[model samples]
Target chain A: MQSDHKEKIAILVDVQNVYYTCREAYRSNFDYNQFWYVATQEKEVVSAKAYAIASNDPKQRQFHHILRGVGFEVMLKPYIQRRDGSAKGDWDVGITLDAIEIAPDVDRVILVSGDGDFSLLVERIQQRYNKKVTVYGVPRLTSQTLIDCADNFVAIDDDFLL
Target chain B: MQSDHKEKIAILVDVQNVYYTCREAYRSNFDYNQFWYVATQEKEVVSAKAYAIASNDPKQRQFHHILRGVGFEVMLKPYIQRRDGSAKGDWDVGITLDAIEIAPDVDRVILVSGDGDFSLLVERIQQRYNKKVTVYGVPRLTSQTLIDCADNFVAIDDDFLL
Candidate 1:
């Protein structure tokens, strides 16, 4: 399907969603290197972003560095501590904005998350921008609505796992 | 200073901030039409975005259409109604991400708000991306730190208002 050399692609990864979903469901780490290689095989990658939360853990920092090494620009937001003790940090809107802003320049947008909230965004990109939409997520954890909306749905498998 | 034909600018407006600030300070509505004209004068406008909350109000919906007519992409988020009767909807992180994502392509970023929270974002754009940052806000309502961080500060005056 990725045979077009003229296809320009932009990938936006929701790190927190993928991290927790993969660990909880499969006890595995997402192999971003493999994902990047597969996603950009014959296409020109215009932008690759990994949205992450800022944490003080050394391991997390190192992991972020590795993501950067793998050709993804790691965008971080502060981890907020709610007054009720629950935390608040997500990149749904951030990813949506980036995808929309880059849509005019790219032929396709690949969103790396299963969150159903982005179903509307996917529809908008397809309808408004006339760009191809692809979604990558662990099938069991991904929202069916999101998968249904995308032109292509890729299930996370052994090849994408560490 | 905006005379350069090669200077590409992206504008991000915090809708809530500007809405309240203009209402409380001048008892008037924000002249988005005027703002767009002045900001895009003698420069290439690569992208213009306005971050807003989804409201059921028809008036607000109409206003959003007007913003679109004036060349602004109105990005909306669902207005979350808290159990305690409060509300939560902010686009700080979303705006920051877009600014960073588009910085490489644009020569300048014009943020239209006075929220002090963006001080760090302004510094990051200037120092990390080496992009010129211009901030537009009412002088009295604008944050001192944000004004200090920006490369250029434009006060919203009579010409910018309806």
Candidate 2:
């Protein structure tokens, strides 16, 4: 498999899920170093986006800056609250829209999320569109269904967190 | 509560779950009247949407036609399939976008769904704008977390079935 060809890919990093999961599990955050090396090893990135919603994490921006340096457009949305006392934010439509539309332009999608709601979308693109979907999620906290939906599942560990 | 007073509300129905769950449990379908009575009895609907995706269900046309006649704007996106042969669809994003934007202008948001994916947003919808979030999902099949997040939980049982 040592060819000079590169597979095209699109990346979706759901900062909300990854942030909370990483923090809850390791008291740390995800590092693009491990992600980039693993995801883009022999792949050409056509589009990359990093998203964060509703939290006041000072660490979010530094990673975003580095994310952009390594190639990613940072999408920021504020934290929203509800009577349910939940203050989480996610970009289901934006990310899914990007993946569906941008996916037609690429052959693979890398979704860094544990959100199982996205399982159907990945399955659709994985086969019908003839694309590969790699899902990166925190161990135990990630949705088991999502892991099974992905063509590849990368468990986030010390290697990808700091 | 029957004077010239009516609260503004928006209704989002995840037809897939409602359609599948009721049939699974009772071998029947939702009656609509029960839902209409409880949800919009004294409320003015700003918007009403129903999603039935990726085709082939006999109820697809039957339900959409009835849904529209009963005041819902039906979006039939067809049950999409994977290249390897599997099919399903959900209005997670479509419904989320509408509820989020409509929340600002409405006093209540009624979502007819059982999928736990909305757990995140339902909490946010009521927390930010002081709007009431009412969830109608089949008991046992519905996400308990979602039920807890709602301002009111209406179980879809024989009371709402034909």
How many clashes (backbone atoms < 3 Å, residues ≥3 apart in a chain or on different chains) does model 2 have? 13
Give the poorly placed runs of model 1, Cα more than 4 Å off. Answer: A1-5, A78-86, B1-162
Per-residue lDDT of candidate 2, residues B88-132 (tens digit): 365786676567768988888999987665876787776767799
For residue B158, give model 1's deviation from the true position in Å: 31
Q: Residue B57 in model 2: shift from native, Å? A: 6.6
Give fnat of each prediction, in order. 0.01, 0.07
DockQ class, candidate 1:
incorrect
Q: Which ten residues in a row have the lowest lDDT in candidate 2 chain B?
A: B78-87
TM-score for each predicted model, relative to the true structure: 0.53, 0.54
DockQ of each: 0.06, 0.08
Best of the candidates, TM-score: 2
lDDT of 1 by residue, B52-115 (tens): 9877899989999988999999999643322211125566656776677788889999999887
| Candidate 1 C-alpha lDDT tens digits along A3-79 | 64668999999998888888877999999988988899888989999999887999999999999999999999643
